[PDB]
Design an enzyme around this catalytic site. Structure first.
Site, PDB file in Angstrom:
ATOM      1  N   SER A   1       0.511  -1.057   0.073  1.00 40.38           N
ATOM      2  CA  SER A   1      -0.189   0.198  -0.011  1.00 40.38           C
ATOM      3  C   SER A   1       0.474   0.966  -0.314  1.00 40.38           C
ATOM      4  CB  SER A   1      -1.124  -0.057   1.371  1.00 40.38           C
ATOM      5  OG  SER A   1      -2.209   0.657   1.006  1.00 40.38           O
TER       6      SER A   1
ATOM      7  N   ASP B   1      -2.604   6.077  -3.651  1.00 45.74           N
ATOM      8  CA  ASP B   1      -1.268   6.040  -2.647  1.00 45.74           C
ATOM      9  C   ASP B   1      -1.350   4.592  -3.434  1.00 45.74           C
ATOM     10  OD1 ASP B   1      -3.720   4.003  -2.245  1.00 45.74           O
ATOM     11  OD2 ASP B   1      -2.931   3.290  -0.198  1.00 45.74           O
TER      12      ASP B   1
END
Ligand SMILES: [Mg+2]
Ligand SMILES: [Mg+2]
Lengths: 445, 445
Positions: free
Chosen positions: A99, A239
């Site tokens: 992530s 992200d």
């Protein structure tokens, strides 16, 4: 004993999350899925982390050593995997990414055939196999061995599905993209150019080392500068794996997930498409987001922090829209997990349906100011109850009378407690906190 | 204890040659090469075996877990790897293949930077690491981790180098190709089409299961049919990894490696390019190949069976050309290992330089007939010496007087001995063998 946390399997790549583990994960994981098909179709995707390659290879090896049919996707956002596995009746989807974390870290996340996370009992059986010390699992040979046909074209499919949820071409809108040098770097630029917007880009030159390095959803300050510099209508900051979205208005201010949720859910209510005119959110959400919901007649369901609870809540009662303040938003009509690009398209839809600037649309939800004060205390665990502290809190709460909120929770790391108020002005925050704080200092210190 | 035989590391894929081993090989192998660079450049190639993917992934994982820079080549012939590693100053080249073996089998073969096999002491250190039970080797993290840039374009480079050794376009020649459904399937068809020959193909539809399945150098009977059926000038049958070549004339007869070596080395002598007008071969070679060499004034060096001895012999004394009867031919001017396509181009060169048909060029080397007879004997190991058997052999040899050859070696598998004669006619074979055979039956049975 536990390798699957809430993000699946995470670790520092090669130190903790070793290619050895990624092999056993792929090998035992494909076994657990071999109870359906005995040639289970499994999709792998990854972000641009340098270690993704080492882990993809080791993981693919294990999947082929128990006969799974493996479909490499290349680099694609986590939403892309979720969408693609369900849209191609695969038995599972794997995403190799960590992530928004620094580059040395990586992770393995599993999706079952529905596009939701793997069932919690399936992940159980995997863990129970990885603690036996003797692999007595099958070893197919010859043509019983697993087979791999790549599908690097899958991004283009996911891209064409997103393009079909755009209510109309985004002509005339100058948009800036921060792709965190991650999974969305090539997806996003093709998606918005293809919808004929004027597109300036940054953080789209990934090289395996530079993911979330002062770019992306969690470091939005650069995109703030870049929008003002290029006089853009808005900025979009995904992200590392493309499940979060944080926006930036023309004046450069950050627009968080609470405000996006507001802006879009109000747009969907306006078109009859928000179902039960309800919106699911976490307790992490700013008080004025609820206030703004009541003023537009949108009911709200609130859940505990964590994607899994927000999605479970929507699933139980057919809810259309859910999300956290972080930028993770679920549009269950279209995708089973948070989808940055999807959020972005719904946001662009609103910008062009109302013709207003993003500054104005984010204005309609007034965020309440917050204030944190940290009180060093001798034993932070005997303040849960206290006739003098628990009293001053209840007093402060009913005084606020629903236009404010208190929260006091002991730090875990340190010998102190965190006192935090939401109120409608910074000054109400200051006093409300200082009342609670000065009686806490009256005991400990 | 020994994992590297004469073909490197072989086994049945997943049973014996496990993805676990391919990882340790890649991980320890890249360590042994980390004494040069600490980011050693390593090339991987493979043939079309389904297990190649499982092994390539696991092997690439180990190479990236000690920091090697990995360059995937895709499917390419073993010559291609050897050529490419030397032509791009890489520290090593790996080839994942098991040559002409059935599909369930695979192997790992290493090339050092010179394009020859890895030094025998380097392979030693690898083996000594794989028998310690505790991997205490480094584990780079973050940017110290290995890095992969693919080079699927490398085939086109190797292809363009081969194309430059063609003395002229092969226009007007109808050639048929049997590529064993292996590494040369795409290389060969592009190579000869690009030199403007008329090209019919078979065994060029690999699918991971069909490698050397009644096709290729070792099953030439199909190509024999296909040449007569399409009225081709010749057929070329490479093996699974492209290091062997067996040809087929217009009348459909097999042309083995002895005859190819003859045909080409005589062509190179004709152009002044065969150096010392010498040719290295193994003892496996037919007697009439030596006879044909003396009649054209080509000296010969003979070695023990095995690529490694033929190449060592050429290296010591600068020899230009070497080879075995199997189709493995080394043209040290151009490549450091046997190269099927290279052999093929030298052969085509001869076909168009002399304008003769391949039937005629193979005629100029008359193969001596051979004959084997198997004598069941009580203890096959006490015939090495025998005043009556060792005598009848020496008698038969000097009678032959250099226009024949005897060989008697006990079978290993079974309780019998193999008596084998070469003579200039089948009838001389029959009698010469029957003399030796009937005195062997006089002792045992
Ligand atoms: Mg994320
Ligand atoms: Mg071979």
């Amino acid at each position: 004993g536990k390798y699957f946390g809430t993000d699946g399997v995470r670790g520092v790549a090669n130190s903790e999350l070793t290619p050895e583990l990624a092999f056993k994960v792929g090998r035992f994981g494909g076994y657990v899925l071999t109870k359906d098909k005995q040639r289970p179709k499994v999709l792998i995707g990854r972000d641009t982390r340098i270690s993704g390659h080492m882990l993809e290879g080791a993981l693919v090896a294990g999947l082929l050593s128990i006969g799974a049919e493996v479909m490499r996707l290349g680099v694609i956002s986590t939403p892309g995997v979720s969408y693609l596995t369900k849209a191609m009746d695969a038995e599972a989807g794997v995403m190799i990414s960590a992530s928004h974390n620094p580059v040395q870290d990586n992770g393995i996340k599993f999706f079952g055939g529905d596009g939701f996370k793997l069932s919690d009992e399936q992940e159980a059986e995997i863990e129970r196999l990885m603690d036996e010390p003797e692999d007595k699992l099958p070893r197919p040979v010859g043509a019983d061995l697993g087979l791999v046909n790549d599908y690097f074209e899958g991004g283009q499919k996911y891209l064409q599905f997103l393009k079909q949820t755009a209510d109309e071409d985004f002509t005339g809108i100058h948009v800036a993209l921060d792709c965190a040098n991650g999974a969305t770097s090539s997806l996003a630029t093709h998606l918005f150019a293809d919808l004929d917007a004027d597109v300036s880009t940054m953080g789209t030159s990934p090289n395996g080392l530079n993911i979330n390095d002062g770019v992306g959803s969690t470091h939005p300050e650069a995109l703030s500068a870049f929008v003002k510099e290029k006089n853009a209508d808005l900025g979009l900051a995904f992200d590392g794996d493309g499940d979060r979205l944080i926006a930036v208005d023309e004046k450069g201010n950050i627009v968080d997930g609470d405000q996006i949720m507001y802006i879009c859910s109000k747009h969907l209510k306006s078109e009859g498409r928000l179902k039960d005119d309800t919106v699911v959110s976490t307790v992490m959400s700013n008080l004025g987001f609820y206030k703004a919901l009541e003023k537009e007649g949108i009911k709200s369901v609130q859940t505990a922090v964590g994607d899994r609870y927000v999605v479970e809540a929507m699933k139980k009662d057919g809810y259309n829209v859910g999300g956290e303040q972080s930028g993770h938003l679920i549009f269950l009509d279209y995708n089973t997990t948070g989808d940055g690009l999807l959020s972005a398209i719904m946001l662009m839809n609103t910008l062009k349906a109302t013709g207003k600037p993003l500054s104005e649309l984010a204005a309609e939800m007034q965020k309440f100011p917050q204030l944190l004060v940290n009180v060093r205390v001798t034993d932070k665990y005997k303040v849960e109850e206290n006739e003098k502290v628990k009293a001053v809190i209840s007093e402060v709460e009913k005084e606020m009378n629903g236009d404010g909120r208190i929260l006091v929770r002991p730090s875990g790391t340190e010998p102190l407690v965190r006192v935090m108020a939401e109120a409608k002005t910074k000054e109400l925050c200051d006093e409300y906190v200082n009342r609670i704080v000065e009686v806490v200092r009256s005991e400990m210190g």
